[PDB]
Amino acid sequence: DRPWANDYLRIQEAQKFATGAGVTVAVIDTGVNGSPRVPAEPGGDFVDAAGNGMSDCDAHGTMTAAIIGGRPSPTDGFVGMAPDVRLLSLRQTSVAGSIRSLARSVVHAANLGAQVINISEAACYKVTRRIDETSLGAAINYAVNVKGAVIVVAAGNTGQDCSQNPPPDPSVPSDPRGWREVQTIVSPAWYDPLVLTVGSIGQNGQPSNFSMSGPWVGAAAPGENLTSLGYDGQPVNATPGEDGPVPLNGTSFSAAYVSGLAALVKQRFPDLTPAQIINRITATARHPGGGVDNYVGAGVIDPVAALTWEIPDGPEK
């Protein structure tokens, strides 16, 4: 039976309207150990010049790919958001700078014909620090405005390298997204709305405590206690840890659900631009108070609404 996210997002209902067939999704992550249920294809390794993206030594990319496009099975209730997509694996990050490799891999995924690009990477900077990523900005522009790729990126997780942003100050009408309060810049997160940046929520529909907040958060999706597929294409729900099993949590998995939705929206409305797919996803999200905020952006995605609601098309750009 179903992973809580599958039920929460009404994935089976959504898949009555599209499955992602004809769409290619690139997974810019730690690589993928492929399998019949996670049939990723080599999209390049940008960490090690040898290797091709089809090796996951971090128990991560494999699960990201499965959330987006893991095929169903008659013997368990797991299926990805869009089980009919082509999956390309670009290994761009690995624990077992990277902003330079990110620009390259974004261009490369676009050049491979990816129409949806999922980026797990979330680099954090002090707000005071001088940030130079002209070529990343150029890469994203190319991929989106020239190649017509929808790009979905992780909000980022709080941690050692990455401190939480305070909420906007309600007493400054002209800073509704709290730019003046930002302490940590997340990238490529801060490219939203050009890309779509995705925060994490728990089973209670509330923002995950580890989810990075900011003026750039565009949407949200399940990112806690998740189920996905492992190195064999079989259900997995934890990684082994020092004091026990660690559940599958991360804004990159949240991003992965949204990339999946984007591929569904793409199959169903093949003439929408990236900006229009993005708009369709955010316009049909369950909005927070105020309609937008720093934690969930436009709110938690709603795949069925995204696929079936009639909404004015936004600008094409």
């Binding site: 030594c57 971090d58 128990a59 494999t62 699960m63 624990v95 077992a96 996905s228 492992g230 190195y231 079989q234 259900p235 997995v236 729900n237 934890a238 990684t239 082994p240 099993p245 599958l248």
Partner: peptide, 10 residues
């Protein structure tokens, strides 16, 4: 390389 992900039965 980290150990593979696993499945914990409910």
């Amino acid at each position: 390389e980290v150990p593979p992900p696993v499945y914990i039965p409910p």
